[PDB]
Structures are given as C-alpha cells and as structure tokens.
Amino acid sequence: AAEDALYEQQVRDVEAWWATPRYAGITRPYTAADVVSARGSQQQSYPSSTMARKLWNLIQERKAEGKPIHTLGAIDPIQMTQQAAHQEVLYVSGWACSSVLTSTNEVSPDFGDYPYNTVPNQVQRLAKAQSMHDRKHWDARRKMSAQERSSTPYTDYLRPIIADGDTGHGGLTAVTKLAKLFAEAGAAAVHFEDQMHGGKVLVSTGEHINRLTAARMQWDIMGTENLVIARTDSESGRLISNNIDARDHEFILGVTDPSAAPLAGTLQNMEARGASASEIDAYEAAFTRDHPLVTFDEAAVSHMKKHNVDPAEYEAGVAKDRDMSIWDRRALAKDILGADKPDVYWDWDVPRTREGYYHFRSGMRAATKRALAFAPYADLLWVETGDPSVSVCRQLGRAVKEAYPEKALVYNLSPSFNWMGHGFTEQTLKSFIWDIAKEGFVLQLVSLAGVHTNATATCELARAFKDEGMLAYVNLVQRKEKEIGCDVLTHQKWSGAAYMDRIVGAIQ
Amino acid sequence: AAEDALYEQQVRDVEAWWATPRYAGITRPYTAADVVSARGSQQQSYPSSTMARKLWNLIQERKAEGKPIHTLGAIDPIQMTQQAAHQEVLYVSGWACSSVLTSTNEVSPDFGDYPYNTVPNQVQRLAKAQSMHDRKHWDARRKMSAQERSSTPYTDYLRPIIADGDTGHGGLTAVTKLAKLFAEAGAAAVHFEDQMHGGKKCGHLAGKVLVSTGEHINRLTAARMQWDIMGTENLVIARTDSESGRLISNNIDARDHEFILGVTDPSAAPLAGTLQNMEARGASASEIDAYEAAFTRDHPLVTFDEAAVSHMKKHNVDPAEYEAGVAKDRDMSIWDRRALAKDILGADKPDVYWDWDVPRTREGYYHFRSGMRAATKRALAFAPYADLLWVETGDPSVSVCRQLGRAVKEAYPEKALVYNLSPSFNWMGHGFTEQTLKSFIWDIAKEGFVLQLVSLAGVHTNATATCELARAFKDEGMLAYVNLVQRKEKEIGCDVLTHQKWSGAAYMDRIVGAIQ
Ligand SMILES: [Mg+2]
C-alpha cells in the first residue's frame, strides 16, 4: 500500500544506515522495525544532523593526526562570533546556564535543577545566531569582487555545538524528550553523566546505559546522527543510589563488624526522640570511625588467610569475572572455605546513608571500567580523572584503546587549577593539550571560559569607570578593541545592519 | 452604598498620591476616577515600584549635588554582579537584546523589531539574578560575627534597572501592555523615543523617522496611565532624536510645522506619484533611483518661513511683520502662517508658493529640519509628561549640554536629564584631552545630566575579552588561559574566580541542610 511501501522502505533504510562506518561498534538493543513504527508518516531533516556529521568527520581527522579539538565554553552569541575563526567547535555548559540563563530566569548554583528545556534553549540561541552571522558573512562576500573573495579568508560561523545534557533530567521518557529538544535546537552532540538526577551520587552502570540507549533511539526515530557522549564521575563519586547492577558490586563497600546496627535506622529513631541535628551528625561521624568499610573481595581474602585457606581460587574467579555478583562471590568463598570454617561476614546495607545511598570505592579503577561499559553505547567517552596529569591520561587512553581502538575521549580542562603550583612549567602548561591529544583525548574544553573572561573584563572596567569615567572606557575598552582588531568595534556592521538594509531595499 | 464608599476612598487615595512631591509638575490628562475604574478589586505590590522610589531618591540627592549617576549597559547577570559595588544603577539596552537575547532567539540588527516582550524578559533575567545574589550576600553576612558585619562593606545587588522601551512597539494599547510587562519584570524606569514604529528608512535618504510631538506625548501618557492603574511609581523617560531625524511620519501637529520642509517651484509635480507611474511603466529600479536623485537636486527644500520671507523680498515687501509674528508664536500652524503672509502681501501681490507634499518620500514621509532647535522644543514639550528627559545632542559637547540644560531649567528648574555616552565616538581624535575626557561626565552632571549611560559597554568588553583569548588559545592552549584569564582574575580580586561560592553554592547547601 501507500503506507506499507513507505514503512518497508524506511525499515530497509534504517537497517542500512546502522551498518555504515558511522555506527561501527555501536550496540542498539532495539530493531529497525521498533524505530520506524514510532516515526509516523512525516519526514523532517534537522541541521543539527549535518553539524553532527561535520563533527564526526572532524573527530576522525584530528584523532588520526593525534591533534586536539580544543574549545572554550561560550555563554552568548558575542562569544560565538569571536571564537568562530579560531575554535573548530562550540561548547555550551549547563553550569553557565544555571547562573546566567534559565528557561524561567531563576538562576541558581548548579544542581541541574532548572527545567530541562534550559540548555536546549541556550543551544537554540547560539545556533540561530550562527545562522544569522553566516548569512551576514555570505552576503558580504557576494558584494566583493571574485578575486577579492580569493584574497579574503572565509569565516565559518557554523561550528558544531556540543551541549550538556546533565543526567538526562529524569526517567527514560524525559531523556528522549531532552534528546529531541537538543536535535531540534541544533546540538551536534550531547553529553550525559552517570549521576543520580537530584557530594556526588552515582547511578548504576545499567541505569546510565539505558539513558544513552534512550537518547540514541530518539535520534534514530528522528533520523538524525547526533553524537552521544557518555560521562562518568566515578573517579570521585563516593556514593551510589542503587546496588542492583552486578557490574558495580566489586566497588560497593560494606561492614565486617557484626556489632554494627543499621545506621539509617538509628538516625531516624534518634530524630524521632527529638535529638539535635548536631547530635545526629555526631553519631554518624562516630559510626563511620568505629566501623571501617571494605569490599567483599577484601573481606573474603582476609577471612581466608585468617582461617588458613589459600585465596588463589577465589582471586582467580573474581579476576576472570570482574562483574561477578555479590551472591556468586559469596558462593565461591564458602566453597573454598568449606563446612568446617565460618562464613565471611559482610553487610553493605548496614552503613547506608539516611537517603539509602550505598558507599562506593571511587577511583580510576571504577572510572575505567565504566568507560569500557559505556563504550558500545557512546560516540565519545568523557572520564573525569582528577587534577590534570599527562600520566593519568596516558594510562586511561591506552586502557580504552586496547579495548576500543577507535573510541575518542573528551577532556575537561579545569579553569581553576593551579597549574604552575602543581609542577607545570610554562612549556608544559602550553603543551598539555597537545600532550594528551596524542593519547586519544581529541575533544577538549574549558567549560567555564566565557564566564571568567566576561567577569574579569567587567570587574576591571566597573572599578575604573566609577572614578575615571570615559577615560577608563577609552583606555580599557575602545583603545584595546581597536588594537587587537576586534570586529565588534564597528558594532552596526558587526550586527548585520548592511545585510538587513539590502533585503529591505529589495522589497521596496 | 458600602462599595461606593470604598471606591471614593480609593479615588481619594489616588488623588493624594498624585499630590505628593514625587509627581510635582507632572500633567495627567485623565482623572483618578478613570484610573480606579480600570483597577479591579485586588491591588498587588510590585518590587519595581520600590526600586523606582529608590531611583527617584537617588536622582534627587545627586542632582542637588551636581553629581553623576553614570553606569554601563549590562547584558547578563555576570556583568550585573561585577557592577553592583560600583555603579549605582543598572542599564538594559534594546540594541544589545536585538543581537544577544530575543524572546524568540532570533537575533538581528537593531530595528526595534523583536517581539516586544524581549527587553522586559532581559529585565526579568537581571532582576531575578539580583535577588539571588542579594539572598546569597545576606546569608553570608548572617554567618559573620556582629563585629565582622560592622567591618565588612555591604554590597547592594538591588540596583535600580533602567530599560529601553523603544518606540512603545505599536499603538497606545501596546504601550500600556509593554509598560505593564516592564513593571512586572522589575524595571524602575523605562525610556520611550519619538520615532515611528517600524524602523528607519533605508537606501536613499536613509535615516530615522520621527512621529509628531503629540503622538509621542500620548505614548508617555499611556505608560503613566498603566502604572497609575497598577499603583506603581516607575519613572517615565522621554527620549527625542529630533537632533538628527530628517523625516517625520505625520504633519498633523502644529508644534512640528516650523521644521517641515517643502518646495517653492510650481513646476515640480509630486515625486512619489511620478515614481509609482514609472514603476508601473516597467522602469527599472535604477531608472527610478535616477529620477528621485535628480528631483532632489533640482528642487531645494526650505521651511515655509524661509519661502515667505524670500517671496516678500522678491516682491519688494518688508518681511518684518511676518518675521515678528512667527517669532512670537513658534507653534503657528501652516494654515495660519499662510494667512499671515497673505494678509501682509495684500490683494495686489501674488501669494507664496510652497508645497510640503510634493517632495514626500515614497512611504509618504515629510522632510524635517533636524537639529537642536527642534530637539530643545520637543524636550520642553515632553517635560510635563516625563520624569527624565533624554535628548540626543550629537557629538559629545559640554557647550551644547550646558545650553540645553539651561534652556530646560529656565522652564522646569527641577527636571533631570539623561546623557547617552557614546562608546564609539573617537573622543581623543575630536578635541578632547585626557583630562577633559575624564572630567566630561562630571562636567555635564553639573548642568543637570544626572543619569548617564554607556549603552553598549557590556557588548564591547565581552567581545574584546573573548577575541583576545580565542586567538591565543588556538596556539598556546592552557598557557594563554592562565596568562589572560586566571592570573589576571586573581590579580584584580574578581570574586568569580571562586565560581562555586560566587554562584551561591553555600546558600543552597544551608537550605537543603535545613530541610532534612
Ligand atoms: Mg551540568
């Protein structure tokens, strides 16, 4: 039929699409029929998908060279226009949005607690400005001679946008709607982090995989090729919201002291009888001191050597199966111990927080494992590694390359770190970006760069303008703007006035 | 009746409100009953009104001192926080909104052609950030000792906001809706300018288009009526660009007639109708462009006064009576000027030939003699309807400012003025020294220009800072970031350096800790 042919043609198309090199190694737990059944009859193309292909190709080219795509977080269209000739991509931060532009105009510290259309609205604001300045630029060039065009460098205002998706802002349907808004707004790529929606609390490995799968399916339904970026904060995240996933069990901490009674219960009982907030804090502090936390692997091997049993059989099994459940680990331990010896005591529930969070052994062991777990679901991997170290980066890069030799990584360049005070020289501060790009960190970003440049410039001017008036404005702004050749100096032309003049002249 | 008694009380309360010194010398063409009848049964209070009173009191204090309230246009909450310790008010420009933040996210050159909730939305964004930083600041101060508070200067993040209302974005009902949005969003004052909504003419004779004097007065009155209905004291700022606007959309108002220009050649046929016939005959745009350019050359424009005096001199008639008559009545209508000239010329002389319709533009606009004569006359006409007067005066000039300030103050000695400080003018290449560049703001504050603003300041500082970092970062990476941002930020004591604290992280941590 008319509908049957269109359906069948799209199923064939989607299956072929997923077989292209763009999606080599990417796992999809759903089918092409699943996707086409959700599409309706109306096809639509999105500019973000052309930008996504531009970004994908740029990543492939720079990764092959061992070279960086390093950029600065931009908070407004002015910053976009001034980066366009220099940075090859544009980054949009949710931290920036939280304090400078929210969908409700209610700004706050970054808890990812703005309405979830906030960062997509900032993407749309930048993408529409990109299109305006590309149109102005194309109009300007058509007014030049053909040879003057060859003499003048082309400015590319259509740099692919990378945007912060936070944790996805709720359940899987929220993630699909957030991904939809981003593809509509213009984002070429979106990153999603393995923290709980609402210091840091991780979600299970499987929960985050499901978020990444939800974003991919929505873009598959839309027919767009936007890039999924998976971020993990398990290098520093000490709490996990959910113990259901066996791939996390080796990092969850528990007690070995059988005289420890569940902490959360004690704390609620205390609050019921009227105990002071400090008294609850004091007991919780003492409880952590009195009862040290270890992994079950650690408790088992300690129990075996204590009872004169070789742990090698256990250690081989957990090494062979990193993701062995706690249930199967206890089974393996008791067989090795046998009937005569007592069983390992270990309880991860007893020390849970008031919220019910479990304790988690953060570090690069957990972060590397999660990066590998996320790799078949993501186009780029973003691992927070702590303070900048070429050494740590090299280790992570090789660990990922040996399992997924084509996966590119992202690095978050800290704006606040004391580089010189922590071992760097001017030479090694300069080469850092290029040093880690050789190890596979292709996309690199100073998240809050546009916040800090803007704050510093206004701070300097505001103080001086109070006492020196227009002398301060000319010295600190007008003179400098002219010296460096900033094209906003002629603001009317910069804004596109000549472009609109021609259109109005054509209409009349 | 009980209800009727209440109504009369509210009417009496409005009348008493309008009799306070805040509204001395302000003309309202409506009654208190008019206002109360539009109010409904619930009145609510608006923070913008508290900010408006704060701004009014600051203007009164600074004007008495001959001192400036000089500020910088801010485009985001970051710039607001860095200005709060230094600039006593905050300015929000519509030019900046047009290129950086529109209610539809469609940025473009400034034609005042974004949807009219655009600048109110930017005001709301800044006002909500002011409240957030005030709450952060207050919370931090309650953590200090009582003595440490006495020793630490209090930062006032609640600076009154002045915002661009463009032309009012349409007819009188749009002006009232826009005024309402600004009062809801948090603006202490709004300025409205006497240009035609729909933007400037483009191409030949490109430039601003003025409305009639009376049209702009009705806009000022509409905004005041809306704020009266709301019970708010926001400040009306009247802006005129008749120092440079060479076209006017409407000739109905006799107060504009002395500036409107016309032809004296009886052989000139109407230009717009000729161009329309040519366009209808297949003539190209260039051939039409040619006829218009030639028409402008062959038929100079003059005011009716100049035509009548030149005509009297040609026919050996003393023009002294005509000149004395129109000097006495600057507002004489063209109808009455023609009759005066005709009576002086007498039955045995031909009458003055002068036609202000023949040279009209294709849109139907009239030609207008721009300059400080028109600008000063309009400033005086708007004065009874405005809390502050904003007169564009051209190149920065203490002399021109002093003349304008004196001219206003001889009729309205209490009236405060606004000065728009150009960020683009080449001060040092046009007669300023470093010393008089510095003193300019204080020099004109002594002449009554109490409120002064660099409207695009936050556009230019932001662009310059990113331009410099973006170039260097491409090649020097984190070395450029440390050299140009991090090190400088710490060396000048910018409090965004510690962005977590700056954003309010400790404030929210205490709220969450108090909830659990
Ligand atoms: Mg975020």
Ligand SMILES: [Mg+2]
């Ligand atoms: Mg405007």
